[PDB]
Design a protein around this nucleic acid. Structure first.
Lengths: 61, 205, 83, 86, 82, 71
RNA sequence: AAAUUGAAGAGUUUGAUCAUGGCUCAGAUUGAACGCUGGCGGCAGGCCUAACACAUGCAAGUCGAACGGUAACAGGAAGAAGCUUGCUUCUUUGCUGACGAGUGGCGGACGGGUGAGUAAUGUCUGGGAAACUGCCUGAUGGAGGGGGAUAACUACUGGAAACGGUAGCUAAUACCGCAUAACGUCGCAAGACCAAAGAGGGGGACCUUCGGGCCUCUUGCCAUCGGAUGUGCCCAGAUGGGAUUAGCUAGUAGGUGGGGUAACGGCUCACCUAGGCGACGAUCCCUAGCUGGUCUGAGAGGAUGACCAGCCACACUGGAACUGAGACACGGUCCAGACUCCUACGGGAGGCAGCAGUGGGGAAUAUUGCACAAUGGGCGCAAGCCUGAUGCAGCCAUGCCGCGUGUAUGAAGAAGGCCUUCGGGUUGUAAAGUACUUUCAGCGGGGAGGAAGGGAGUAAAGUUAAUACCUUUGCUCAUUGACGUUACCCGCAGAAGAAGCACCGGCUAACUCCGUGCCAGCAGCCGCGGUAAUACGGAGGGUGCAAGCGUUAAUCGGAAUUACUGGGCGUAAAGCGCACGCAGGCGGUUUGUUAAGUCAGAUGUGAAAUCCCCGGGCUCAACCUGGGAACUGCAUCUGAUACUGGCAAG
């Protein structure tokens, strides 16, 4: 079971993600997170300082 | 790297003095030097004991301007070598040529020095040197590239060095653009308001 | 003398001849803890004649393989279990 | 993809096998004649067999077909045995 | 059986050669029997780019060793018999 | 067209759908490169100060759709 | 001459406390992956997963100074033809360079890769005797003379092929017999016994079909016997986990004699005979290449074992042997096996756990590169050829380090941003303006080291059959770069061509406004969010670190929380329910003695480098490197006899 960080919804009712270890303890069973900026399940839309975790490319200029 | 963008500002966090931006009008004048920086500089500090230490390892890191990956190494050296660590570390740090040309007064701020070493205007033992950090051995010739005996950065810093500088452990000559680096520090030969025993305390666990 | 394999040992069995069974008690300190402690190394030695019995003390020396495990030959009996 | 250049080595070694095998046999039928000559029990016919063996083995030794200390072992063990069955 | 031949050590176009009595049928910085000298083909603005033990060489040759094509040329380089 | 640094790993010419060997490709030839896995049809590959994109781009769109699921 | 001050703590249980105790945290490390970003150079590393199949090319040859020989090519060349007027062209000639194939010689058993097996029937450490060993090297001794075969070639004849086959011929340094036959070989000795080859370079005289005997040197070859180096073997000690694995073992344990290996050995065997192993953990099952060493740590300890280096096991999967000095063969054979390929449809082929690369696996890992030049391996008389070892370059911020990203001046404190008790602070000398300068990058010129060597030449130490040949000291002259237009150096523009990432409640350095109102959303822990949120989302400001930064994974520590160094047991987890007692642990007190532990000493050993230390060099450093010292151990001898153990008497 993986938790999915960030807002801008989950994606991928039936496709491929990369997962990573890690708890968020208040749920039951979570041992994993998905890396939103990796493979699919798109980097979390918007945001401007918390970017590296949950990928957001340098916001353009 | 080369750590730039807002230079007396970094010093005002360090929250006493520092040997920066020393050409002209800076030393409380057109810069505020005390208070503290930013929007929450008017009120007094929270601090922390981890703070006082880390901020003084930073201070001394900033008065010589090196990076942590170098400083981690100078700590390694002070431990690695047979002499007392905190004192020896100041020594080990000082033996760097880029501060030496500065100690010669061939610049009057280190960055002036560091540029003319790196942009290849200095020669040590008559041999072309641009390694800025370079180990100057105790008893070495310092000499400056012929072409460089004339930059506004050279001439002005020579008069800045004039009746300012001539220490115990180097001796210097202005017309000849020359210096004799005498030795490295023991305890006595270098300081400022700096903490040495607090950093060894910090680096040791 | 000067480099030969010659040892002393306790005899713990004689039951088939020409074999003989010699048990060696060795001290070593246990390598982490200290305590000099025992392990008993047990060795095949050529008998030739039933000169040895059980509880005896013998001397054994290297003499190159004669049968499997069995490369030592018997020298002298110090003490014979006084049977 | 093919065999590098092993071919000529490959063929020779069979010719050589057959060649060895023949003289190895030549001696073998003789080694067997010696023990069957030990069983026939006679010193005279069996030492005559040993005397027949002493030229036969040694050239096998020299030319590398039994070589080493191999000759020697065959030579000796059987030679004495004839004497233990005088 | 062995050789006296050079072994290579150090780095990309500043190699140091280190001079070695070694087994014939093993790597040129495989296994070895005695280390018998040092050679630097970088002599540049330095001395001590050749140091070698004559006594060992002589030991090795009277028992039976070939000295290599470059090692015979280190002999040519040591120049103490001219 | 991407603006990326390339190597043409080796080049092969096609006879049937079997592979004939040449070792370079000059003007007015057709061929295949071996590997070189990133590129998509309509990409232009050019000299070190490249013609950047050639005109080409234009082909038709897909008339009828079906949904797929694997078994 | 180097050991030498690496032996931090914090938050969490309660109203609050001291304790007890688990969890989490700040450190260092990586063969790493990923997100966000990203300038240069150096150096170093790059499939850990499927040892999973592999397309394509390449990773092992070489001697014509062995031999029969003469398709090839090439040259010289006899004669012709065309005639050009002596040149172009033909035929034929091994004449000569030269050599495809073949016979035959030596190297494919070395180099390289891989870690599946295997708990050492190989390994690590020392100690062993029963042993073999091509070159190489030391010494002696010999090499006399002859026979036949057979490749090729050449005819024939099969096969769409792969690969043949039927027939006849010819050599050797291939084969074979013969001579002779030890300091050898077997053995009481008597006695028996086996060997080899020339070939080449040259010739200063002779013989002579100057074919060639021969003369002269080089060199090759054979017997013995040591050398050296390698390899076979052995014994003891160390080595992962389980006893919710406790009885295993008869070729097993031992002997006797025959057999056999290069050698001792149930190694094998027939007789025997009755053992051997095991709680000091056999056996069984699980897991596992080892070791130097790496990491971590004060140390002790713990972790760890293609990064390099020794060792060892493996070779499509499985068996067996050949050949040879060497193997049971990494590009051999044979068979079986699973899988694949040609097709001819009859029958045959093949092994990327070599190098590069494909597909498949997976989070994840490279170039179908340059070159024999240097180094070193191979063959060679040597020139020479051969080298996906080996050097480099290619490709990845994967690590480690160096170095850059202008520098100084510069407000009376500018727009913009932000808060604002609206006073004003801040962002900030930051910015603009100013003066100076240009590493690297970009661009033009010059350019170290790696180059040592070999060839051919006179002479000459010198065999000296004179001044040949050979041979070598030097001397002689031309002459060796894969990288590569490399470092390095000079010059020319310009403030220009170039900085990110994360963090700011406490732990933990650093802080506020505004966006939401149990949500949206953060969490390594503690927790926060339910109307003014220092957590959440963004703006300002701030801190940390930087060509990176963060994060999740992984080891150790922190952890004294599996404690030997260094814990505990009334109640917190914790003493057997009680006792006897076997094995084992432990031993009052004395004399003597022995000399196992014990300790000192000496000598051999602990590969290289690594670690550590003192030097040195690449503009430093990363790095690379000379010697020191460590190399915490074993070995045997001598020694010290208090202590303990042995042993005899109290």
């Amino acid at each position: 079971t993986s938790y999915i960080g960030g807002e801008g919804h989950n994606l991928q009712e039936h496709s491929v993600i990369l997962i990573r270890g890690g708890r968020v303890k208040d749920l039951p069973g979570v041992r994993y997170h998905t890396v939103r900026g990796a493979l699919d399940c798109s980097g979390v839309k918007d945001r401007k300082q918390a970017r590296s975790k949950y990928g957001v490319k340098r916001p353009k200029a | 790297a080369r750590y730039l963008g807002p230079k007396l500002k970094l010093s005002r966090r360090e929250g006493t003095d520092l040997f920066l931006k020393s050409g002209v009008r800076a030393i409380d004048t057109k810069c505020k030097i005390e208070q503290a920086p930013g929007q929450h500089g008017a009120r007094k500090p929270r601090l922390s004991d981890y703070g006082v230490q880390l901020r003084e390892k930073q201070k001394v890191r900033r008065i010589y301007g090196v990076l942590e990956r170098q400083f981690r190494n100078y700590y390694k050296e002070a431990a690695r070598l047979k002499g007392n660590t905190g004192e020896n570390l100041l020594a080990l740090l000082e033996g760097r040529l880029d501060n030496v040309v500065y100690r010669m007064g061939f610049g009057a701020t280190r960055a002036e020095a560091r540029q003319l070493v790196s942009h290849k205007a200095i020669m040590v033992n008559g041999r072309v040197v641009n390694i800025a950090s370079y180990q100057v051995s105790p008893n070495d010739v310092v000499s400056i590239r012929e072409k460089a005996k004339k930059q506004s950065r050279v001439k002005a810093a020579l008069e800045l060095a004039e009746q300012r500088e001539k220490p115990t452990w180097l001796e210097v000559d202005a017309g000849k653009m020359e210096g004799t680096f005498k030795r490295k520090p023991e305890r006595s030969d270098l300081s400022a308001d700096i903490n040495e025993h607090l950093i060894v305390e910090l680096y040791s666990k | 003398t000067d480099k030969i394999r010659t040892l002393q040992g306790r005899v713990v069995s004689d039951k088939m001849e020409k074999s003989i069974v010699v048990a060696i008690e060795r001290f070593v300190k246990h390598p982490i803890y200290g305590k000099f402690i025992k392990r008993t190394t047990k060795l095949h030695v050529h008998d030739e004649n039933n000169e040895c019995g059980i509880g005896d003390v013998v001397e054994i020396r290297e003499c190159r393989p004669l049968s499997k495990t069995k490369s030592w030959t018997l020298v002298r009996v110090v003490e014979k279990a006084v049977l | 993809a093919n065999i590098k250049s092993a071919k000529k080595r490959a063929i020779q070694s069979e010719k050589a096998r057959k060649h060895n095998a023949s003289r190895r046999s030549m001696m073998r039928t003789f080694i067997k004649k010696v023990y069957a000559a030990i069983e026939a029990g006679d010193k005279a016919a069996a030492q005559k067999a040993f005397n027949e063996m002493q030229p036969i083995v040694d050239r096998q030794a020299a030319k590398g077909l039994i070589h080493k200390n191999k000759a020697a072992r065959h030579k000796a063990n059987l030679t004495a045995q004839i004497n233990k069955l005088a | 059986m062995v050789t006296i031949r050079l072994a290579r050590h150090g780095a990309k176009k500043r190699p140091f050669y280190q001079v070695v009595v070694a087994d014939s049928r093993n790597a040129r910085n495989g296994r070895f029997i005695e280390r018998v000298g040092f050679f630097n083909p970088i002599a540049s603005e330095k001395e001590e780019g050749t140091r070698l033990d004559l006594d060992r060489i002589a030991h090795w040759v009277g028992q039976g060793a070939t000295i290599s094509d470059r090692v015979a040329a280190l002999i040519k380089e040591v120049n103490k018999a001219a | 067209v991407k603006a990326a640094r390339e190597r043409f790993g080796r080049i092969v010419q096609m006879h049937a759908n079997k592979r004939e060997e040449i070792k370079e490709v000059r003007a007015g030839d057709i061929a295949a490169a071996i590997g070189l896995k990133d590129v998509t049809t309509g990409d232009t590959l050019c000299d070190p100060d490249a013609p950047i994109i050639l005109e080409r781009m234009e082909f038709p769109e897909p008339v009828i759709s079906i949904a797929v699921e694997p078994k």
